[PDB]
Design a protein around this nucleic acid. Structure first.
Ligand SMILES: *O[C@H]1C[C@H](n2cnc3c(N)ncnc32)O[C@@H]1CO
Ligand SMILES: *O[C@H]1C[C@H](n2cc(C)c(=O)[nH]c2=O)O[C@@H]1CO
Length: 94
DNA sequence: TGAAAAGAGAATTGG
DNA sequence: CCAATTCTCTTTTCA
């Protein structure tokens, strides 16, 4: 049984390594607050779908749909700012 | 002033 | 049965 990345792991990994900075970036790195690019977010979503191996092309609408489910478990919450989210502090350094 | 963004229930699916 | 994936409909927001 193989393992596949979780959405919050994929996103957090992109931010820490500095990948796809034109697609997603930190807004407040100390607070774990990050924002997606209005025009270039579809590039990131489709990259998420290729790595997962999904049947359909991944879109930001479907990626955002998955992000909202994290509200039950607290990994990521939506911030009251356009395309902006916040990792829980348990997933961040000191 | 419509695309964009936000939100959502629900059946589905790989593993 | 987890962790999304996919599809659908709705409304507010914004550029
Ligand atoms: O066709 C109507 C509505 C449209 N329009 C575009 N952007 C608008 C804003 N910000 N306020 C109001 N109406 C807006 O232009 C026409 C009215 O001038
Ligand atoms: O939660 C139930 C179903 C669940 N389950 C079902 C099936 C068909 C599967 O392949 N994996 C799996 O975890 O297990 C529980 C019953 O043992």
């Amino acid at each position: 049984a193989r393992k596949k990345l979780r959405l919050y792991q994929f996103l957090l990994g992109l931010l820490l390594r500095g990948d796809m900075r034109e697609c997603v970036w930190w807004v407040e790195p100390g607070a774990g607050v990050f924002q997606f690019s209005s025009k270039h977010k579809e590039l990131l979503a489709r990259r998420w779908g290729q790595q997962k191996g999904n049947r359909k092309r991944m879109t930001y609408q479907k990626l955002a749909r998955a992000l909202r489910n994290y509200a039950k478990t607290g990994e990521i919450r939506k911030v009251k700012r356009k395309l902006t989210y916040q990792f829980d502090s348990a997933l961040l350094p000191a």
